[PDB]
């Protein structure tokens, strides 16, 4: 035995305050509910809002954010005590419970460039891009040993001294008994925790342009190991500390600083979505089940006038079809590909940026800005282990998402051919001699192309105006020729819409000032009404947030084609293939193959999902047929 602590005033005060903060029955109950939730979900980490902690107790907030280690120890002791009070049987399962933080950190929210010595031992929140992600190695915290000679069993305990002074006696792994009998380690009884080290780099867009990047090393212990991968944008909250060196009679002042992450959260807070909202969505779907699709289409891109069919197709894309995984492993894609081939200044790029802002997992690619390995998967060598590793590309990242390819026409034929597999079956098959991989990228492609000669010459056929081959065009299920029509009436409409949008001003927030050109305030990307208010300057309209939530809920639904819609679609496809479907002076904008029948089925399923139909009915089939009829033909003038 050694110098134990009898009573500690500061520790007792801290634990009492944290237990009080966690016990919420006289208060709203947020954290009691959260602890119950983690008990139900079988976890051992609680995310506590620093804002709530500061609200209920300013002193505890300052102490936790300025001296994190012992404060977090006290908080975790209080957490374990509270979990035992709620249910001791579960509290006994896990040795310890952990306290991750979230919310807003005033001056402790820094970038790897701004994470300086001043924040040592404090809690900091760093948002950055992952560059390196080591392997998840087990680290032994309690080793069980058996002596065959004496039949004894022993347990050796190793303290987590990652940042504390460590002496060899602590880390001596036992191999011999007291009388030099051999000891066999029992792996099935020892205790190991997953450990990983990653590197967080200053975001390229937020970093100063001139200078080189700055990065910080992050240690992730159990429950936080495989939360991030290289290239991801993440927020890591944890204690910035100093790592001890190794025993030596001489030392330079230099110390190796790291960040012991207490929680890690994805930048894609938009990648994920109350009973009030659920009931609101139910009533919205039920009330007007026929014109809901049209209302959503019109409200999709409010800032862009016209383009009704283009917006309908974009909505069908955002909804996606229903994949068919057959009994033999065969795959029929459900994503929907749209190619906006258009004259200059027709809002195709703006539609691309709208889908970027709205859809979850939307990746912006440009014609020559993403070539080959940058656009699809890649194979490299570790350069340290001499072993081959995969590297996800734009479309692999965009898996279960959308890729917005601006200036698609001006991509090299090499890249356009490479994208064929992603478009059709949604995967990248890449192999070097060492390693072969079949990565999944079930992304939907939204391409913005301009025609040869710059402006679409309406006298020439669409085949000539589109500088793309039929094999490539067949990849795009919907192909929209967006001309800059010279009608004075439509010009009046467009000009009025544009000038109204340019005149609009923010409500109250702005009164004549200039938009500003970030660490001061919480980062929006990581931050925690059915219709819009009918402003006359914006309308002369479903809400953005409600549209997001409704599209999220309607994406999951999986309508099934009904025999009547199947017959209708089959007959329409036969006609579309037939020559009579196109009159004289009308030219096909894309050859009609079985890919177009798949387009019809996917569009009808997307419409049924927009309606939450649960069955793709003749209404949906007719809408898909009409959209395909509009998209796949063009009338050439003489």
């Amino acid at each position: 035995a050694g110098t134990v602590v009898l009573d500690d005033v500061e520790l007792r005060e801290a634990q009492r305050d944290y237990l009080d903060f966690l016990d919420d029955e006289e208060d709203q109950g947020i954290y009691q509910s959260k602890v119950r939730e983690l008990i139900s979900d079988n976890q051992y980490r609680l995310i506590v809002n620093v804002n709530d902690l500061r609200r209920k107790n300013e002193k505890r907030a300052n102490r936790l954010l300025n001296n994190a280690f012992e404060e977090l120890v006290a908080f975790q002791r209080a957490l374990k005590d509270f979990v035992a009070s709620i249910d001791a049987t579960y509290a006994k399962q896990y040795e310890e419970f952990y306290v991750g933080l979230e919310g807003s950190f005033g001056s402790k929210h820094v970038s790897p460039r701004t994470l300086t010595s001043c924040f040592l031992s404090c809690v900091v929140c760093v948002e950055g891009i992952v560059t390196k992600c080591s392997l998840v190695r087990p680290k032994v915290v309690r080793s069980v040993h058996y002596c065959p000679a004496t039949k004894k069993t022993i347990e050796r305990r190793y303290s987590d001294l990652t940042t504390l002074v460590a002496f060899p006696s602590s880390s001596v792994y036992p191999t011999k008994d007291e009388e030099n009998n051999p000891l066999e380690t029992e792996y099935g009884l020892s205790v190991y925790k997953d450990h990983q080290t990653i590197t967080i780099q200053e975001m390229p867009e937020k970093a100063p342009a001139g200078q080189l990047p700055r990065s910080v090393d992050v240690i992730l212990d159990d429950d936080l190991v495989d939360k991030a991968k290289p290239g991801d944008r993440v927020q890591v909250v944890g204690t910035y500390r100093c790592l001890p060196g190794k025993k030596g009679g001489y030392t330079s002042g230099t110390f190796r600083t790291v960040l012991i992450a207490c929680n890690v959260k994805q930048m894609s807070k938009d990648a994920q979505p109350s009973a009030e909202d659920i009931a609101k969505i139910k009533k919205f779907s039920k009330t007007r089940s026929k014109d809901i699709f049209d209302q959503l289409a019109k409200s999709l891109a409010p800032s862009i006038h016209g383009h009704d069919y283009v917006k309908k197709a974009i909505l069908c894309l955002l909804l996606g079809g229903v994949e068919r995984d057959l009994e033999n492993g065969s795959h029929i894609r459900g994503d929907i590909n749209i190619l906006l081939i258009g004259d200059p200044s027709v809002a195709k790029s703006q539609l691309l940026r709208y889908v970027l802002c709205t859809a979850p997992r939307a990746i912006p690619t440009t014609g020559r800005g993403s070539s080959g390995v940058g656009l699809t998967a890649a194979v490299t060598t570790d350069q340290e282990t001499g072993e081959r590793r995969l590297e996800a590309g734009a479309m692999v990242l965009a898996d279960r998402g959308v890729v917005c390819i601006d200036e698609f026409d001006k991509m090299s034929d090499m890249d356009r051919t490479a994208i064929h597999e992603v478009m059709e079956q949604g995967r990248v098959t890449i192999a070097k001699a060492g390693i072969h991989a079949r990565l999944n990228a079930r992304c939907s492609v939204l391409a913005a192309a301009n025609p040869v000669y710059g402006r679409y010459d309406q006298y020439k056929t669409p085949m000539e105006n589109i500088g793309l081959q039929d094999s490539l065009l067949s990849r795009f299920d919907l192909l929209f020729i967006m001309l800059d029509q010279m009608d004075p009436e439509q010009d009046r409409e467009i000009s009025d819409h544009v000038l109204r949008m340019h005149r609009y001003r923010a409500p109250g927030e702005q009164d004549g000032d200039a938009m500003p050109l970030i660490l001061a305030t919480d980062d929006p990307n990581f931050s925690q009404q059915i219709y819009e208010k009918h402003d006359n300057l914006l309308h002369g309209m479903v809400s953005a947030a409600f549209m997001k939530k409704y599209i999220h809920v309607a994406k999951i639904i999986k309508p099934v084609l009904t025999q009547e819609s199947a017959t209708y679609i089959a007959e329409e496809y036969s006609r579309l293939r037939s020559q009579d479907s196109m009159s004289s002076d009308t030219a096909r904008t894309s050859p009609v193959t079985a890919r177009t029948l798949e387009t019809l089925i996917r569009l009808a399923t997307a419409h049924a999902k927009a309606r939450m139909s649960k069955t793709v009915d003749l209404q949906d089939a007719e809408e898909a047929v009409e959209l395909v009829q509009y998209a796949y033909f063009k009338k050439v003038l003489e």
Partner: protein
């Protein structure tokens, strides 16, 4: 000497319009784009140099980047450290500023892509094997160039320019500078140049002018009054109708279109004019001046043919 309309356009470019983001999330750039096609004798390079020197944040480069400094931004992962080094070109170095791109007609294809996608959306989108970023390039592009034949011959109107409609749409204003026939202008120019050289008041010094520009940009963001917007709508409708009529009469698609980008360019010029005075709203006088400048730009869209 001279070039008063170009100088007014340069002032409007320096002060910029108003950057806007609508509730849906989209953005409308408030930075004007100016192109100066003209004979090599004129002082286009000198104007670009002065604009770079006077802008708060301004970089003067060429179409093929600069010596040891590119034009746009690239990102490369260092295999050893695995960090993504971001090599910043002129566009990303002059974020929230001005890029004076001399010899605009001599760019590479990658530079052409980047400028296409950065002159309107103000961003450069890059996707290497590791990351998929979207850099921010808020920059007014002041481009210079020369006729495809070196000098502008009216006999080949609409053929003295090799630029595409897609890139001329990105431009808010385009000027054509000729030097053909004026003995009086030549003697005046010689007098003025010899003066300048021997000499080497209503003129704001460079420092105060730069500070003034920065102050206006940071403080004031104007908008359009309803009457000014209606006047602009009418003028834009008539201008587009006239462009349609001229194109149909010539039976050739003019290689300098008039589009919603031109409407927004007039809007931005009016906003810049109001911002000069710090009027939170733009008036009919400002929209009329913006329309006059866009007409001086249009003296090649229709008159050239």
């Amino acid at each position: 000497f001279g070039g008063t309309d170009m100088k007014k356009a340069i002032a409007c470019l320096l002060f910029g319009g108003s950057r806007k983001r609508l509730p849906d999330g989209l953005t409308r750039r408030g930075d004007i784009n100016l192109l100066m096609l003209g004979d090599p004798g004129t002082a286009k390079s000198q104007l670009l140099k002065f604009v770079e020197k006077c802008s708060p944040i301004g970089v003067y480069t060429s179409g093929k980047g600069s010596s040891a400094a590119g034009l746009t931004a690239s990102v490369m992962r260092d295999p050893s450290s695995r960090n993504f080094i971001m090599e910043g070109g002129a566009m990303v170095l002059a974020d929230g500023g001005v890029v004076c791109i001399d010899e605009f007609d001599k760019m590479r294809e990658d530079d052409r892509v980047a400028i296409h996608e950065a002159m309107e959306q103000q961003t450069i989108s890059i996707a290497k094997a590791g990351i998929t970023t979207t850099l921010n390039s808020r920059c007014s592009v002041l481009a210079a160039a020369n006729s495809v034949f070196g000098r502008w011959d009216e006999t080949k109107g609409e053929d003295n320019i090799d630029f595409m409609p897609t890139i001329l749409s990105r431009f808010d204003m385009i000027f054509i500078v000729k030097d053909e026939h004026n003995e009086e202008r030549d003697v005046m120019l010689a007098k003025h140049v010899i003066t300048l050289h021997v000499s080497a008041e209503g003129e704001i010094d460079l420092a105060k002018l730069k500070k003034f520009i920065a102050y206006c940009r940071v403080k004031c963001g104007p908008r359009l009054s309803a009457e000014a917007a209606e006047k602009l709508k009418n003028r834009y409708i008539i201008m587009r109708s006239g462009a349609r009529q001229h194109e149909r009469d010539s039976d050739r698609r003019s290689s300098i279109p008039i589009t919603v980008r031109q409407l927004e360019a007039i809007v931005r010029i009016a906003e810049a004019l109001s911002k000069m005075k710090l009027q939170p709203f733009a008036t009919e006088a400002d929209v009329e001046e913006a329309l006059r400048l866009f007409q001086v730009s249009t003296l090649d869209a229709a008159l050239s043919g």
